[PDB]
Amino acid sequence: DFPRSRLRFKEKLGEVHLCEVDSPQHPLLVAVKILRPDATKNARNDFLKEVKIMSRLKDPNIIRLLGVCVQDDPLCMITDYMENGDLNQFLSAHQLEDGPTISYPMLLHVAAQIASGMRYLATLNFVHRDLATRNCLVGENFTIKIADFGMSRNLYAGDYYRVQGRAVLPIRWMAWECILMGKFTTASDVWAFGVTLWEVLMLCRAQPFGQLTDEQVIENAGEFFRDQGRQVYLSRPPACPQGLYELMLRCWSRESEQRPPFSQLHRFLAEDA
Ligand SMILES: CS(=O)(=O)N1CCC[C@H](NC(=O)[C@H](CCC2CCCCC2)NC(=O)c2ccc(CNC(=O)c3cnc4ccccn34)cc2)C1
């Protein structure tokens, strides 16, 4: 166990507490997710599996499990703390340089880190399943950590399609094969990365396919399957030159084997820096 006596409460954020730690080897800031002790057994099991999965994940662009406190109650997991909250709210508060304000190159450096992060996970055959800027965190100097906050935050309910007794689905980010089968792969993670790169280039000014209903997005997935010319695509954002747009379009290839691997996507977005 990490020692509880080394976590000095700073701020609230089942609760997430901003904390600082002296001489962990400025004091180190860490984020501490605390499971309520009235927590159900299902919730406790989920928290122990979230600990198990995070434990194996060690990359500059993925949230990092720093320590746990589980031998006693309440159950604690400790991650690194990202100062600027999730990437969706962060970019929504920004505008493209001609404020605050973010240059085009910085948008690519943001996009490349998410790609470097997905690339790491692909070397483990780890499929994210719900990649989107709302699951990315921003630290200092626009460093990006992929995370997964799950599917039940009110702020983002609209990004999820729910049917009673079914898995809740982030359909507007999902590959056509996913929408039709529940079959998630690294290749489908690539598709969702294409939609994440679209969001970043939109500086998050709109939801994908936002003028179309849930049902129309599902219908669109069927048209990729039918492949008689009726499938439609996310448009090119204002900030996006046509070359970068053509990278996004490759992410939405019908055949998952024609979609770019993350190694290549990272290589191409990291080039400008
Ligand atoms: C297995 S599942 O698909 O069924 N399931 C569904 C429900 C969601 C589950 N997620 C998870 O397992 C991941 C496991 C890692 C994930 C990594 C990416 C690749 C896939 C795996 N848990 C988290 O992402 C996580 C995130 C933050 C924190 C605490 N730190 C903070 O909040 C924090 C830190 N800085 C700030 C700044 C502002 C506010 C808060 N913070 C704790 C956990 C997955």
From Swiss-Prot:
Residues annotated as the enzyme's active site: D130
Outcome of mutating Y104F: Abolishes interaction with PTPN11
Domain Protein kinase: 7-269
One example GO MF annotation: protein tyrosine kinase collagen receptor activity
UniProt-listed GO biological process terms: axon development; branching involved in mammary gland duct morphogenesis; cell adhesion; cell population proliferation; cell surface receptor protein tyrosine kinase signaling pathway; collagen-activated tyrosine kinase receptor signaling pathway; ear development; embryo implantation
Modifications after synthesis and translation: Autophosphorylated in response to fibrillar collagen binding.
Binding site for ATP: K33
Modification Phosphotyrosine occurs at: Y104, Y156, Y160, Y161
Tissue: Expressed at low levels in most adult tissues and is highest in the brain, lung, placenta and kidney. Lower levels of expression are detected in melanocytes, heart, liver, skeletal muscle and pancreas. Abundant in breast carcinoma cell lines. In the colonic mucosa, expressed in epithelia but not in the connective tissue of the lamina propria.
Modified residues (Phosphoserine): S23
Domain of life: Eukaryota
Keywords: ATP-binding, Calcium, Cell membrane, Disulfide bond, Glycoprotein, Kinase, Lactation, Membrane, Metal-binding, Nucleotide-binding, Phosphoprotein, Pregnancy, Receptor, Secreted, Signal, Transferase, Transmembrane, Transmembrane helix, Tyrosine-protein kinase
Mutagenesis / variant outcome for changing K33A: Loss of kinase activity. Complete loss of the collagen-independent constitutive activation
GO cellular component: extracellular exosome; extracellular space; plasma membrane; receptor complex
Reported function: Tyrosine kinase that functions as a cell surface receptor for fibrillar collagen and regulates cell attachment to the extracellular matrix, remodeling of the extracellular matrix, cell migration, differentiation, survival and cell proliferation. Collagen binding triggers a signaling pathway that involves SRC and leads to the activation of MAP kinases. Regulates remodeling of the extracellular matrix by up-regulation of the matrix metalloproteinases MMP2, MMP7 and MMP9, and thereby facilitates cell migration and wound healing.
Similarity section: Belongs to the protein kinase superfamily. Tyr protein kinase family. Insulin receptor subfamily.
Domain notes: The Gly/Pro-rich domains may be required for an unusual geometry of interaction with ligand or substrates.
Assembly notes: Homodimer. Interacts (via PPxY motif) with WWC1 (via WW domains) in a collagen-regulated manner. Forms a tripartite complex with WWC1 and PRKCZ, but predominantly in the absence of collagen. Interacts (tyrosine phosphorylated) with SHC1. Interacts with SRC. Interacts with MYH9. Interacts with CDH1. Interacts with PTPN11. Interacts with NCK2.
Protein name: Epithelial discoidin domain-containing receptor 1
